[PDB]
Amino acid sequence: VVKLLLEHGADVSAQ
Amino acid sequence: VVKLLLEHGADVSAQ
Amino acid sequence: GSGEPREEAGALGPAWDESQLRSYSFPTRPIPRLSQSDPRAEELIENEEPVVLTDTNLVYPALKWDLEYLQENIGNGDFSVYSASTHKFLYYDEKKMANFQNFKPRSNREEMKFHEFVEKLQDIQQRGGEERLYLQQTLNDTVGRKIVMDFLGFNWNWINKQQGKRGWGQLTSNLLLIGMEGNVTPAHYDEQQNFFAQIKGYKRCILFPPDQFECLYPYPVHHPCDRQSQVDFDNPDYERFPNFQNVVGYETVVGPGDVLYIPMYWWHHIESLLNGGITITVNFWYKGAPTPKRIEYPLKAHQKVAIMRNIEKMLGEALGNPQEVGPLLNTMIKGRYN
Amino acid sequence: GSGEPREEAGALGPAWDESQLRSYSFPTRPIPRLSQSDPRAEELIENEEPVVLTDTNLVYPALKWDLEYLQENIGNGDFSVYSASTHKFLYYDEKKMANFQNFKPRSNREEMKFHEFVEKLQDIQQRGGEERLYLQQTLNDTVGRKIVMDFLGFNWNWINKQQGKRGWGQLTSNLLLIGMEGNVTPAHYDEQQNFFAQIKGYKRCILFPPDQFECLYPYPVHHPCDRQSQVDFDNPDYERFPNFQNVVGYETVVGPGDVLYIPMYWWHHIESLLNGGITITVNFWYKGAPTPKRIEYPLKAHQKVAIMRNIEKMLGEALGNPQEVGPLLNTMIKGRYN
Ligand SMILES: O=C(O)CNC(=O)C(=O)O
Ligand SMILES: O=C(O)CNC(=O)C(=O)O
Ligand SMILES: [Zn+2]
Ligand SMILES: [Zn+2]
Question: For 2-oxoglutarate, which residues are the binding ones (chains C, D)?
């Protein structure tokens, strides 16, 4: 639920 | 995911 | 609209006439009136589209019901009765009345015995009172022996078959509704399949399909009026709700013996005809069919509604406060998606 | 802004001067410049607030780096190099370039060997070319023996300690950035903790905290420019992005030996000073600390961003098409939450 909403990716400005 | 979003309650106009 | 007023058997004249219908700013097409034996009606239910069935005999036994008969046999349980100073009975979810304190209801619920309701009804009638009532009670075991005989007399064979054919869930309840003439239950939608059985009096039912969501403007999910339209059908605010000018409805008038199928997630506006006397109805609420394993795209309108509802539910949980749902959502779309 | 231009050791005069900084419509306060031994700096990192550390010796060995030394020892792997006809290098996520075909990039990626880059650099210089380049490559095993000696010479003891103290995840990569003077990486935010180590040249870094989300207007999550601002810092469109007029930034200029801590989810604008020569930087990206068991309310700004991001991600999955995210979201708030 809320924890899942909280969870984040690790995308950076690098292809 | 999408199935969870799809899932619905059963609220009616009755207290 | 509701087509030419049907003619009663025995040359008893028009059941009702146009002057008994309130006036609204939108156009409407008529809902189909078919026989339960008609394959077209079976096609409309299967495609979750409204249809008025004329011969089901669903509540044949209750057709003899009237205030005297019920007061006499309904039993001694409590009956919820809503009060109003206006003809509009907007529904209020009491459990949700904490998230919005800047809110005060226009309809008060009051428990009371059946004979108390009938008598309350009678007092108003003589003292010329403008005050209005609406009894809305779930039918339960605490009812009379005669009423239990009637209930058991309903056409379960036909409805349980529909239940089966559509894959619906269990019957959740049977709401008994007795209201004064002119009474109006404003536009809203329910999360269950509904077989609306008219018993006494006439009711005008205006439905709107699920895809009309953008034109009806439901209150926020956490608001007490969740699932209801914020648009005053009598005085529509086109500045706040522009798309209401694009709303098109399906209409009809049901009487003793008619069964209206109100598909789940379909908007409905119900009004007891002006000067037609009290009205009596009993509905049959069934949980919808479970969500299919394989999701098919494009998604149906009702499914998108289900999604929007969940988003608001999770967001309210995640933020810890429903009041923050709005500001987060706006921040999410301003200059980004709009 | 970046305070009075620091004076070089040995009376070598101001390192840089105001005329080397581009002009913007917003105000800025200066980021703190402290010693890694200063407890105040340890307080700023712990509270995920930017801070420029002046003595870490994080990349002491690389301070001798320059084009000749690298071409000579960087090895023979391929190096991503982006091209631009403008000073702005907007990042493009190629994997996401299918959801938006009405989109064409302003920066082209091109693989090439280090000596090819240096020579490409040189050609432009002589032929007076307005065209610009920006090398951005992750450091990997295919590098020279000397570069491997340098890398190993970085102050791992200090940074691995920070890693430990903050609970961060693993080091995901070290990006090597070599860009021409005047080059600008427009405002955006990364989902990782970053220790930005300046090696050669000067860079102006303007940061904005997470709560400034509403003023920066990031592209939709499914768009190739996800995590970047839609606002042209050179010509801001106040009609589309009104709140950009309320944006306040944190600014600074880093040089050889300075380490800027860019907290995860903090907006950053990086520009190599005008006429300051090429610039060289190596960043250190670490995954953030895991989400704590007990969630504390009110939620932090970065957490709300995380939520908005997921909403858009799930909605895009649920609808089967990112193009429908916008219309569903608008339909959800119009006349309901706004
Ligand atoms: O009968 C009424 O006045 C209102 N009925 C309903 O809203 C219903 O059956 O779903
Ligand atoms: O150095 C640059 O030009 C851009 N750097 C970054 O965006 C970063 O390190 O996160
Ligand atoms: Zn970055
Ligand atoms: Zn209803």
Answer: 134, 185, 194, 203, 283
Six token digits for residue D14:
């101001």
Taking the CA atoms of D279, D59, D142 and D146 in sequence, report the sign of the dihedral they define: positive
Residue D119, amino acid: E
- Is there an atom of ligand 1 within 6 Å of C260 CB? no
Query: How close, in Å, is residue B1 to chain D by CA atoms?
Result: 7
Of C259, C178, C266, the C-alpha closest to C216 is C266
Cβ pair C285, C192 in contact under 8 A: yes
* Residue A2 contacts D where some CB pair is shorter than 8 Å: yes
A6 close to C (CB below 8 A): yes
- Size of chain B, expressed as the number of residues it contains: 15
* Range(s) of chain D covered by CATH 1.10.287.1010: 295-338
Taking the CA of residue C184 as reference, the ligand 1 atom at the shortest distance is 3
**Distance separating alpha carbons of residues C304 and D110, to the nearest angstrom:** 42
- In the DSSP assignment, the letter for residue D212 is G
Q: Tell me, rounded to whole angstroms, the distance of Cα D158 from its chain centroid.
A: 22
Sheet with C184-188, strands from edge to edge, namely C28-30, C249-254, C203-208, C267-272, C184-188
Q: Give CA–CA dist D269/D251, Å, rounded.
A: 9
Fold for the domain defined by D295-338: Helix Hairpins (1.10.287)
- Ligand 2: atom nearest CA of D271 is 3
- Cα C127 to Cα C297, D203, D323: the distances in Å are 59, 85, 61
Q: Which tokens sit at D308?
A: 């908005």
Q: SS3 of D201, please?
A: coil
Alpha carbon C163 to chain centroid, angstroms: 19
Question: Taking the CB of residue C240, how many other CB atoms lie within 10 A of it?
Answer: 12
Residues of chain C with CATH 2.60.120.10: 1-294
User: Which element (helix H / strand E) includes C228?
Assistant: none
CATH class for the region spanning C1-294: mainly beta
Interface contact D227, partner A, CB < 8 A: yes
Tokens of D108: 């082209």
* Residues whose CB falls within 8 Å of the CB of residue D216, separated by 6 or more in sequence, listed in order: D187, D208, D229, D231, D244, D247, D267
Exposed / middle / buried, residue D23 (Cβ in 10 Å: 0-12, 13-18, 19+): exposed
Determine contact: C311 vs chain A, CB below 8 A. no
Distance between CA D134 and CA D181 in Å, rounded? 10
Interface probe with D: pick from B5, B6, B7, most Cβ of D within 10 Å: B5
| Cβ-contact D110, D81 below 8 angstroms | yes
CA angle D149, D38, D248 (to 5 degrees): 95
Shortest Cα distance, chain B CAs vs residue C306, angstroms: 6
Is the CB of D317 less than 8 angstroms away from the CB of B1?
Answer: yes
**Interaxial angle between packed helices D325-333 and C301-318, expressed in degrees from 0 to 180 and rounded to the nearest 10:** 70
Pairing of strands C259-262, C192-200: antiparallel
The residues whose Cβ lies within 5 A of ligand 3, an ion, are: A 13; D 190
